[PDB]
Amino acid sequence: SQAEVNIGMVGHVDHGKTSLTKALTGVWTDRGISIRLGYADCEIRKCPQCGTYTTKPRCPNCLAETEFLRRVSFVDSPGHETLMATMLSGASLMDGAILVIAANEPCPQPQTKEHLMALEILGIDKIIIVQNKIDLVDEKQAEENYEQIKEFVKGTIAENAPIIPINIDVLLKAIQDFIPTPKRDPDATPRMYVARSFDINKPGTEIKDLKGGVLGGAIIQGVFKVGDEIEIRPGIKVTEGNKTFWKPLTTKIVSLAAGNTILRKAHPGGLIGVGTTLDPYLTKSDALTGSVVGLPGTLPPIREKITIRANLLDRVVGTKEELKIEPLRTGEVLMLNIGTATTAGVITSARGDIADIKLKLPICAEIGDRVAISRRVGSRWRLIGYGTIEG
Template sequence: MTENLPQPTVNIGMVGHVDHGKSTLTRALTGTKTDIHSEEIKRGISIKLGYAETPVYICKDADDNEKYERLPINEECKLKRVVSFVDAPGHETLMATMLSGSAIMDGALLVIAANEKCPQPQTREHLIAIEIMGIKNIVVVQNKIDLVTREKAIESYKEIKSFLKGSIAENAPVIPVSAYHNRNIDALLKAIEDYIPTPNHKDNADPMMYVARSFDINKPGADISTLKGGVIGGSLVNGSLSVGDEIEITPGLQLTKGNKQVWENIFTEVTSLMAGKSPFEKIIPGGLSAVGTKL
């Protein structure tokens, strides 16, 4: 069963302490490995913002019970929406990267490992960060339950609830999972659908996009005739963008004029649009997008 998927409609941040399983959980939810850079693979931690997406289907099992799946299990499954995930680094030295990612998050999964005391340093810092950024739609994920006994899992749950008390996530659901073994992922998908709604966007307003990163897609040594312009990645929050549109990037380029440092806006043309893994002629708000330019 295959279908052309629509553009993602919501961005969900994956936040929490280093090595608590954010990237593994992203892979369990999407089937995509987000730690793809050589230094990330060598060190075993996320360094850059990772991106992945998944469709969410509501299905009926053999006993006619509703289940939430990332892949259709039968012809009766119905697509609810497509979700984008932003996998943020958990290491303390990479908080600036996490904060840049939080600007494009509509909700968050706060990942907490059941086999460590709660809170760990970045668990606390990431919760403060998403609170400062005004991210109110939160699901707490108690990961690595496969590594602890039932008694320890209950003790960990109580620690998590105590830690969350008085915070923006006090009433957030706590979903136990084993991301490594893909256990209880259906319950997590249901919680995402129940607690992280698709935001309301102004589709008819002037386009505005938050840029989280930029990158060069040309391979080293590429012939000049095949070179392509730079790509900016982020989230369109208002309006729409189409291939051929002229866009303005601010604050732009820093220049020295006389004894002053000034910023000049950059103008360029949209040459391609990608939302998730699919090309589009036009994108609307929601999800993560890549905009090809002539830069």
């Protein structure tokens, strides 16, 4: 069994989502605002006897063989800006989320407010709220923090989310109750985002012992089967004759895996290791990150220019003036994230909330796809908005 759902771990970087990720998965969560997906799988098990919920093969409170229920995957990003961009670009394919809020600090913390805004923009309503560090602080601090949380979420998409003061048993239960696997169409056209790519060969391996490059796929919809012939949109730049266009990569799925679990099929949920026929040099060090995979001839069109509808984000994280709200202008150079792809671009025409943008790098996307927008707000790139492709 692979992961059936993607769950975002959000909230201020110091409120506790990082340790919480480790406890449920045994995984240590770890020049432009790139898309860098962080995945962490958690197998929810239960004990027939005591009914305790756990990730352990044998019971925590009765050493009995637990039973498998469902596998889930948590999604995180290196930092705040990156996580926000990863959600607004559609790269994260969230079905639900866990918003971690510390009790020892005011509540609304900027980052915390901003993450909720991304959840709302994304229409993600399967939320579980965790009031961490209740151990610290006293009975008035808590209860005051609790009311701040209820206030902060009032009027938002998380107004009815369970508030859980934090134990592994209670959280796993809640994940199962409040974030159920969504209904998906088994026959939807197979499409996939390449979030990572690698060369799994160690130094000095013999040529006849070399293995096809491996892809780190985030399946958007449909089912991919081992043996499927696939096509890799944007491909690579080639110079034949007097041209230099972008040529698609065609290869075959040699294997599929959910972490270390072997699969024959693979659908949306978690990061899927896709073994291919591609020579290792084409995949090494995420060379192909931001690409789109699908069955031959079924991939969305390649765009070198685009028209988007953009919304300015009402940010609270940042200094002053840096917090200003500035509309897109003609001639501006932006940094865009669409899918798991990242590319610079310049505005050839700003007409209100609409802009024609010429990209430095080709993109494979459908009309209606999401876009994360950033601008050099000083000595670094800063996320200023989000939108969709309408042309």
